[PDB]
PDB file of C-alpha atoms and ligand atoms in Angstrom:
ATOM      1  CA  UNK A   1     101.526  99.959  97.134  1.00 25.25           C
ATOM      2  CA  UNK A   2     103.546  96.170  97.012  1.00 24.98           C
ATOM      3  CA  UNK A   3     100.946  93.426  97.417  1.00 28.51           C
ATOM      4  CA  UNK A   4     102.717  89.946  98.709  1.00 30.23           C
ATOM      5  CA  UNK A   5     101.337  87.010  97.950  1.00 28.22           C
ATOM      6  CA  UNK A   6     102.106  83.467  98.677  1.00 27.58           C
ATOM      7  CA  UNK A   7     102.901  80.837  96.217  1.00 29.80           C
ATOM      8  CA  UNK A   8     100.739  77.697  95.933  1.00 32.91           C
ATOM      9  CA  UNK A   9     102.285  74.992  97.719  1.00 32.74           C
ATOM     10  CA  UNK A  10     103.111  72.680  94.767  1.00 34.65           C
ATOM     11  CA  UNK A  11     104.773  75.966  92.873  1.00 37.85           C
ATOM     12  CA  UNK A  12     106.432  76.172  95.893  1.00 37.72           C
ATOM     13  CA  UNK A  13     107.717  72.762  95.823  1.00 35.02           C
ATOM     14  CA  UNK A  14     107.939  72.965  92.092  1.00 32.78           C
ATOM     15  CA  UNK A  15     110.441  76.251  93.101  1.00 31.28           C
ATOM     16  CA  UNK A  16     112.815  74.210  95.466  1.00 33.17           C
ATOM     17  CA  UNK A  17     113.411  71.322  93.210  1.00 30.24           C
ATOM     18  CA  UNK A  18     114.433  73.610  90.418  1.00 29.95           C
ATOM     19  CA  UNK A  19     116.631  75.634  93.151  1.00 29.21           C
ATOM     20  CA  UNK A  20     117.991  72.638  95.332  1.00 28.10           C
ATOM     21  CA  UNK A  21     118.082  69.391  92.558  1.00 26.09           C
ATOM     22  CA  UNK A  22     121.661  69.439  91.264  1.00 23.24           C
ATOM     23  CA  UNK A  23     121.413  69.683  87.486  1.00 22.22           C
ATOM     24  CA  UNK A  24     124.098  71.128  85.373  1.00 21.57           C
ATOM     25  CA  UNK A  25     122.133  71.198  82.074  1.00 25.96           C
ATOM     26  CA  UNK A  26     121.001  75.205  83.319  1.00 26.72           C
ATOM     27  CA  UNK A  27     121.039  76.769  80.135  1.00 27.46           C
ATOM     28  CA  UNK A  28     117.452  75.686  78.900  1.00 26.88           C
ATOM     29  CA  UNK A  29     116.093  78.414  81.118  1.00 27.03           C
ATOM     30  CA  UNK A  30     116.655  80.504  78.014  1.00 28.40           C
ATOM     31  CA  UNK A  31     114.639  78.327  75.287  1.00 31.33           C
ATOM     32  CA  UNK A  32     111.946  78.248  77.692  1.00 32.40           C
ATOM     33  CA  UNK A  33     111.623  81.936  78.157  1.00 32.89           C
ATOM     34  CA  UNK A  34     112.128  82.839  74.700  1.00 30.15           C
ATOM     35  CA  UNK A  35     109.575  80.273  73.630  1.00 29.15           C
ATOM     36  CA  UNK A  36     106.883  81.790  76.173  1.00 28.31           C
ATOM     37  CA  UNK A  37     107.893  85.239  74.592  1.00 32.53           C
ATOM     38  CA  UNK A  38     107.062  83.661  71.004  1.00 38.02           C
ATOM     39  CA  UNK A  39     104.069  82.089  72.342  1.00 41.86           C
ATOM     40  CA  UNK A  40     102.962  85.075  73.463  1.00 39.13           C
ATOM     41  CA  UNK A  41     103.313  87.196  70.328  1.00 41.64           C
ATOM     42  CA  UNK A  42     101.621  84.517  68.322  1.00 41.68           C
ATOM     43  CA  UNK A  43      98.373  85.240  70.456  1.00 43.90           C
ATOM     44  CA  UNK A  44      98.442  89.128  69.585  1.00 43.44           C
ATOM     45  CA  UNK A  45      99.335  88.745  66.239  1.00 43.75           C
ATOM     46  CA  UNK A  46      96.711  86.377  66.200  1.00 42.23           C
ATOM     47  CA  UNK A  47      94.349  88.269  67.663  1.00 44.41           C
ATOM     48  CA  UNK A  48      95.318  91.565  65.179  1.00 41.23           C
ATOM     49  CA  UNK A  49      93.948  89.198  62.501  1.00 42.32           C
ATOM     50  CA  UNK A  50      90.248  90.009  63.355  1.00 47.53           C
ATOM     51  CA  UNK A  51      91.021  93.233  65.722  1.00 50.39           C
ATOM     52  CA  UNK A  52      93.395  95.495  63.497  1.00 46.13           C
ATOM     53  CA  UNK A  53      93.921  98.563  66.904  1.00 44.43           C
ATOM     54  CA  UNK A  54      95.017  95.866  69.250  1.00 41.93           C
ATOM     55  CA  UNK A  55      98.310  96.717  67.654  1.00 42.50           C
ATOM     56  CA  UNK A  56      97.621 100.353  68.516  1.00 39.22           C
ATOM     57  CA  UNK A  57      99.894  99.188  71.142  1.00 42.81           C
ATOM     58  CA  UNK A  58     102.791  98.589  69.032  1.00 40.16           C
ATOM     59  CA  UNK A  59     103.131  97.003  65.341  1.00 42.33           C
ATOM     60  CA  UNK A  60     106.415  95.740  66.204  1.00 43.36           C
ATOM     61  CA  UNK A  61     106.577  91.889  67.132  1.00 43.88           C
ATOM     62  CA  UNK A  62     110.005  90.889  68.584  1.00 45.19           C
ATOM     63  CA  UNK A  63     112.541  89.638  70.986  1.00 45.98           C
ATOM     64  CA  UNK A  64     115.044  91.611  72.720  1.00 44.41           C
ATOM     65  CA  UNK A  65     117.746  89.756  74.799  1.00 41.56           C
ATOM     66  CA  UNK A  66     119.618  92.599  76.696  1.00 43.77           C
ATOM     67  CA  UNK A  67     122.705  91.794  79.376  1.00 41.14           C
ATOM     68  CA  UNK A  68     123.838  94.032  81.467  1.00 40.30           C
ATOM     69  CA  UNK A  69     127.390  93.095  84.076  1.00 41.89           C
ATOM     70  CA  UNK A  70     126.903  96.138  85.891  1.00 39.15           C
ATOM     71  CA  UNK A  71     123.472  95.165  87.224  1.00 38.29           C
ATOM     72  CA  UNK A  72     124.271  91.208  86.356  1.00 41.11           C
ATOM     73  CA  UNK A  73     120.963  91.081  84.724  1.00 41.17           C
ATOM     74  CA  UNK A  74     119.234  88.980  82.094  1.00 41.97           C
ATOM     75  CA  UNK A  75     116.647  90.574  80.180  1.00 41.97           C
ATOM     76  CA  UNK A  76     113.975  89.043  77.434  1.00 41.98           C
ATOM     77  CA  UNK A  77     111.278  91.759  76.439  1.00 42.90           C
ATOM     78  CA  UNK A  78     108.809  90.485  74.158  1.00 48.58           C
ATOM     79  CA  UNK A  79     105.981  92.450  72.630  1.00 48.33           C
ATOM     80  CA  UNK A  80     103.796  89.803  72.888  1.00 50.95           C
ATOM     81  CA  UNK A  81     100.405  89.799  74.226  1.00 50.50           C
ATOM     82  CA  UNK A  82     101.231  90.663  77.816  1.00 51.89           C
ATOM     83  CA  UNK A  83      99.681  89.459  81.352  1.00 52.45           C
ATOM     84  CA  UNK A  84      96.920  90.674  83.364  1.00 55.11           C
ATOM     85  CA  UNK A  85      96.973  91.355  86.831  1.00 56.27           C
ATOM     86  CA  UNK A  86      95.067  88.199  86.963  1.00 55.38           C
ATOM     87  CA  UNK A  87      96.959  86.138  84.598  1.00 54.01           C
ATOM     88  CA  UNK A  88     100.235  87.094  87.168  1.00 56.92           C
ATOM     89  CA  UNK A  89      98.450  86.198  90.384  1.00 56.91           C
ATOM     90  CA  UNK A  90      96.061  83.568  89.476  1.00 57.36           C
ATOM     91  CA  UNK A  91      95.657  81.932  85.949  1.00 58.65           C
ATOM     92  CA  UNK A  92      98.995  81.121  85.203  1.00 56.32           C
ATOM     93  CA  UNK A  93     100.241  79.654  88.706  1.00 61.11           C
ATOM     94  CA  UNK A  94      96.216  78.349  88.637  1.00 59.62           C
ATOM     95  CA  UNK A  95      97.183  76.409  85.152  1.00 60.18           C
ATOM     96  CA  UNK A  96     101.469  75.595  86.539  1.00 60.34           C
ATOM     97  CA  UNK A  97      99.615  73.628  89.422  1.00 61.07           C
ATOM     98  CA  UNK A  98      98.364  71.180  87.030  1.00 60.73           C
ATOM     99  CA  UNK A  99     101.352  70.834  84.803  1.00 58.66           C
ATOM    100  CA  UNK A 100     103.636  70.607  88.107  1.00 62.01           C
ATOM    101  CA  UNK A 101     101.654  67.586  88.747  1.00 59.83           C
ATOM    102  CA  UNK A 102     102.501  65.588  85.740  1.00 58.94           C
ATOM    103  CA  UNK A 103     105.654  67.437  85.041  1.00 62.10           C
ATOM    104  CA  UNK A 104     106.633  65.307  88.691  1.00 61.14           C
ATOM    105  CA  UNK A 105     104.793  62.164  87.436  1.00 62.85           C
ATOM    106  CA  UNK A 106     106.267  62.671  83.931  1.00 62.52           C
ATOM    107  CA  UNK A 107     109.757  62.705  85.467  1.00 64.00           C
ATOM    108  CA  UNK A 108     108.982  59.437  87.392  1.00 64.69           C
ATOM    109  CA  UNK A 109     107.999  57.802  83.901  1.00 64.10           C
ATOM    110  CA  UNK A 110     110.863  58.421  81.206  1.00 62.61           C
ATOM    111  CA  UNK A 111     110.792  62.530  80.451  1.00 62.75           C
ATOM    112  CA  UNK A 112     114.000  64.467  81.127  1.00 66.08           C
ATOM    113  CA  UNK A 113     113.895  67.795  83.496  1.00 66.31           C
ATOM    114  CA  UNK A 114     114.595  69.551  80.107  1.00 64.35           C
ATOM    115  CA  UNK A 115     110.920  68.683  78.989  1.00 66.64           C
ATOM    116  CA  UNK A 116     109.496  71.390  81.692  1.00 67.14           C
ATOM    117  CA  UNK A 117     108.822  73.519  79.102  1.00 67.44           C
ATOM    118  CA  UNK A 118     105.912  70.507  78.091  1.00 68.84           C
ATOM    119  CA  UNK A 119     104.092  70.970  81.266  1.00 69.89           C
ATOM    120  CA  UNK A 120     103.695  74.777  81.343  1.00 70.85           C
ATOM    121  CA  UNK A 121     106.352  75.416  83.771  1.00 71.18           C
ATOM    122  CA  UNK A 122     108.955  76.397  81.788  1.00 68.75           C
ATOM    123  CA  UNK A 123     108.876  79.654  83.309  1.00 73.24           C
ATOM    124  CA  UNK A 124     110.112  78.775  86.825  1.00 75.27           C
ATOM    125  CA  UNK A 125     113.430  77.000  85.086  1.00 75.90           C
ATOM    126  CA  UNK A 126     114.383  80.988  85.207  1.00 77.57           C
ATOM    127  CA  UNK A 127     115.583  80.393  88.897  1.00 74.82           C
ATOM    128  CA  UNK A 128     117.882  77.800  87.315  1.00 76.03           C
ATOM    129  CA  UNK A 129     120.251  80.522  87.065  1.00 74.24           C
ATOM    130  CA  UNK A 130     118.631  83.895  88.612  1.00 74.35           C
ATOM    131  CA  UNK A 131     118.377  84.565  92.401  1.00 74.16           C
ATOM    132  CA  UNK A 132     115.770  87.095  91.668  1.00 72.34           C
ATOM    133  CA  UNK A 133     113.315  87.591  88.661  1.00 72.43           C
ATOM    134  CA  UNK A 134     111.177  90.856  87.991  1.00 70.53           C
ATOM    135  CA  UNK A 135     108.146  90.770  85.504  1.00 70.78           C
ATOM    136  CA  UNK A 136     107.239  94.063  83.740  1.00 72.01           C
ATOM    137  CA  UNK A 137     104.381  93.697  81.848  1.00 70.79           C
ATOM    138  CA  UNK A 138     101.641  95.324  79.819  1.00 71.35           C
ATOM    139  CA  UNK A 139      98.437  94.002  78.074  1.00 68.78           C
ATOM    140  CA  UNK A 140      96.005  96.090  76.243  1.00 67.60           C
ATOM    141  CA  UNK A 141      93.184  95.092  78.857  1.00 65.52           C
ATOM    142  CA  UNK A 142      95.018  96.402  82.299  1.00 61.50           C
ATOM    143  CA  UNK A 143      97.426  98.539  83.342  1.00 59.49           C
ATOM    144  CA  UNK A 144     101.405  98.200  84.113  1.00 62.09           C
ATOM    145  CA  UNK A 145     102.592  95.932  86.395  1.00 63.03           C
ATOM    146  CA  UNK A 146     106.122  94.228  88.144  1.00 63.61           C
ATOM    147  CA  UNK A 147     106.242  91.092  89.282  1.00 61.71           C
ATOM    148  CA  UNK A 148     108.792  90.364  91.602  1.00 60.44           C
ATOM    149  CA  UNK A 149     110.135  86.729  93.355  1.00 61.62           C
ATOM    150  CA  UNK A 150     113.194  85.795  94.984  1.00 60.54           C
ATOM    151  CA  UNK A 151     111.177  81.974  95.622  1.00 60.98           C
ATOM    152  CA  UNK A 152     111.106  81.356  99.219  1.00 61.18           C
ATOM    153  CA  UNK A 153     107.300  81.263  98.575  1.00 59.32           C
ATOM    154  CA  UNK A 154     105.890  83.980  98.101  1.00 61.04           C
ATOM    155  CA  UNK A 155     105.698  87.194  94.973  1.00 61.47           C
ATOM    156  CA  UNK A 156     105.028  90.304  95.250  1.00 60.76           C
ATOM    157  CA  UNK A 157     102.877  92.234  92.296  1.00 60.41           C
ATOM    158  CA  UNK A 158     102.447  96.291  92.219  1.00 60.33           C
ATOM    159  CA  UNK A 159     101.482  98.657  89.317  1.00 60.95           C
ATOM    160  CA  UNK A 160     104.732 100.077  87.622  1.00 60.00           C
ATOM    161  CA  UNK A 161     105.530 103.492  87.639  1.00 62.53           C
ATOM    162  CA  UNK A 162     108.583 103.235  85.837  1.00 62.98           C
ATOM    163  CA  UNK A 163     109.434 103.997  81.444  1.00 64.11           C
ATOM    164  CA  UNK A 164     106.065 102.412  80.047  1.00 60.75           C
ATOM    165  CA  UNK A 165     106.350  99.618  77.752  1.00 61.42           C
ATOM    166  CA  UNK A 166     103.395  99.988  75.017  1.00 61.20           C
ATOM    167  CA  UNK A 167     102.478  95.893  75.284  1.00 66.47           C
ATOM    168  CA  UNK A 168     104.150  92.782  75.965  1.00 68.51           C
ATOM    169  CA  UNK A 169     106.570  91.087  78.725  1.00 63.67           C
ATOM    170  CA  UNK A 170     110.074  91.723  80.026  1.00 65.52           C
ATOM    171  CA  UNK A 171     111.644  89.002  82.385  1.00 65.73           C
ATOM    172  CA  UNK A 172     114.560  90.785  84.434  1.00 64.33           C
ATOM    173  CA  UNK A 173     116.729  88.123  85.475  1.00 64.12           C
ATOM    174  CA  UNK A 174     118.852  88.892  88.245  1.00 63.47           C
ATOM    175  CA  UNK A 175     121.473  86.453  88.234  1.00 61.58           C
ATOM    176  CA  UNK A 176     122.920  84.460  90.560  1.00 59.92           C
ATOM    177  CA  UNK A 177     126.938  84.658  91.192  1.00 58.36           C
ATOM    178  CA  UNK A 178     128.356  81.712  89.908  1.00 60.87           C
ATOM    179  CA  UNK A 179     125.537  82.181  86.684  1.00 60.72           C
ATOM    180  CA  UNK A 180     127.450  85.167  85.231  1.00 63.17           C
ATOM    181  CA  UNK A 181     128.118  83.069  81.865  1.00 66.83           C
ATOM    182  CA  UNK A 182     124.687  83.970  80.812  1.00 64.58           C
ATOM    183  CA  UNK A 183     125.897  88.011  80.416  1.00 63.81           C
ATOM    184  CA  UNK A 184     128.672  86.638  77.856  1.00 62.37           C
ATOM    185  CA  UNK A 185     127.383  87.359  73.810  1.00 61.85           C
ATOM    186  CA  UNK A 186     129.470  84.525  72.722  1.00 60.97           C
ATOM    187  CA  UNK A 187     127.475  82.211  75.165  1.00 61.55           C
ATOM    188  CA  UNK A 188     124.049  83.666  74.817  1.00 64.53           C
ATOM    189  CA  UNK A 189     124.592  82.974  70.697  1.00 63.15           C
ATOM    190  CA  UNK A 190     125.587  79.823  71.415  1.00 58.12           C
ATOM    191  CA  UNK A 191     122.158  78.995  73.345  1.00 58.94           C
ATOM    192  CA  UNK A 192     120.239  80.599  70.693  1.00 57.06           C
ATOM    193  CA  UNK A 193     121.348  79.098  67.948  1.00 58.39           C
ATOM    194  CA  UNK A 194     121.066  75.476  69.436  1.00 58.77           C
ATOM    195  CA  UNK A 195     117.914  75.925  71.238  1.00 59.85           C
ATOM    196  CA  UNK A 196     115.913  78.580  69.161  1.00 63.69           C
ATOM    197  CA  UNK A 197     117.700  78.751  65.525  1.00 65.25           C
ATOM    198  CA  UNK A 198     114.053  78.394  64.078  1.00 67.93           C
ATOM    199  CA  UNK A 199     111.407  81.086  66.387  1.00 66.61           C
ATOM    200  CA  UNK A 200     109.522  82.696  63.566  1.00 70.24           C
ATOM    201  CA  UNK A 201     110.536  86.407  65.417  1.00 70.47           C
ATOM    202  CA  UNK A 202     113.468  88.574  65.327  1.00 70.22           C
ATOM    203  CA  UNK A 203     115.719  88.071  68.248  1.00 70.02           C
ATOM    204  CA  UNK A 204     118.095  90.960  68.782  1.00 70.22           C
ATOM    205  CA  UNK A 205     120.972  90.303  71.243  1.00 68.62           C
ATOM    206  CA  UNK A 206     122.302  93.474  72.394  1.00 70.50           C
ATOM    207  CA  UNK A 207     126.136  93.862  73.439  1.00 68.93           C
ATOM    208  CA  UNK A 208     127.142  95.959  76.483  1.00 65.26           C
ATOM    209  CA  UNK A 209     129.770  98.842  77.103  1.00 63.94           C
TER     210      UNK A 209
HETATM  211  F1  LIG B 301     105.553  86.387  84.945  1.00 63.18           F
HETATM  212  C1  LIG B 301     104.924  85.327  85.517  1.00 63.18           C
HETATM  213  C2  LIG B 301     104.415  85.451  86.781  1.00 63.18           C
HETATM  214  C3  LIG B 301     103.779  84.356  87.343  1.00 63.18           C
HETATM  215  C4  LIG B 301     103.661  83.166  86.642  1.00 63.18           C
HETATM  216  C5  LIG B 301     104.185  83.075  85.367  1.00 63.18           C
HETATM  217  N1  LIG B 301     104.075  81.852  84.634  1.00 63.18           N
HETATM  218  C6  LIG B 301     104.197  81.692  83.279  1.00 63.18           C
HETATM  219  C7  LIG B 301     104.027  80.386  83.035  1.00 63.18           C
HETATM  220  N2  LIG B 301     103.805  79.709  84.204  1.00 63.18           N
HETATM  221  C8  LIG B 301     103.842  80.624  85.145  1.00 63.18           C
HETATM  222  C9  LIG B 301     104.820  84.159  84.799  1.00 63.18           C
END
């Protein structure tokens, strides 16, 4: 049972300008999604502080980065916190309307594009390089659920009925064409190492076949 929704008009907007403006400086969408991964395994871990069995759900608090050519994907799974089915069709794009707005009016002043990750719109630099992202996620509070968008605006959210995940986030990034750099360990390192050298969590970086 797939449930389509439409975007909000200024994520919309927000969607095309990351899709359409020509920007060569695509790489960031990886700092940005590995620094929402951190983020959110500093809220469970924070939350285990006072709540020892919310880690019931796994003790483990990491970053995976997984490429795959065969099905030119992108993967980051986190074990953070995870999303509600509210968080993925309401807070989040309800809290990304706001920071659109003065990410735009930020740009008009003196911030680079690069800043998105400021305005709580990081997440949508993903299409800076995929034609297609799925969400699986997992928090302790709801069930299962993907996440799907290929922009044009509007998502689509069902519960997942595929290998469970325990708790946390995995953006499945399905990469555009001419984007394929992305699936190369040498280049991946290289992004990591200038962009997150310092995130206070294991990233692994697996290698392929
Ligand atoms: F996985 C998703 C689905 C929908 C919105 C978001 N998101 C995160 C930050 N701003 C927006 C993430």
């Amino acid at each position: 049972e797939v449930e389509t929704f439409a975007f909000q008009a200024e994520i919309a907007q927000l969607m095309s300008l990351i899709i359409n403006t020509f920007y060569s400086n695509k790489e960031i969408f990886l700092r940005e999604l590995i620094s929402n991964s951190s983020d959110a395994l500093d809220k469970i871990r924070y939350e285990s502080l006072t709540d020892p069995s919310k880690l019931d759900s796994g003790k483990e608090l990491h970053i995976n980065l997984i490429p795959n050519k065969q099905d030119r994907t992108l993967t980051i799974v986190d074990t953070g916190i995870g999303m509600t089915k509210a968080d993925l069709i309401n807070n989040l794009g309800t809290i990304a309307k706001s920071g659109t707005k003065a990410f735009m009016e930020a740009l008009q002043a003196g911030a680079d594009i690069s800043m998105i990750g400021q305005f709580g719109v990081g997440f949508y630099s993903a299409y800076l390089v995929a034609e297609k992202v799925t969400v699986i996620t997992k928090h302790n509070d709801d069930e299962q659920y993907a996440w799907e968008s290929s922009a044009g605006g509007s998502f689509t959210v069902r519960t997942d009925t595929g290998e469970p995940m325990g708790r946390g986030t995995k953006v499945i990034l399905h990469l555009k064409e001419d984007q394929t750099e992305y699936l190369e360990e040498r280049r991946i390192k290289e992004i990591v190492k200038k962009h997150s050298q310092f995130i206070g969590y294991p990233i692994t970086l697996f290698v392929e076949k």
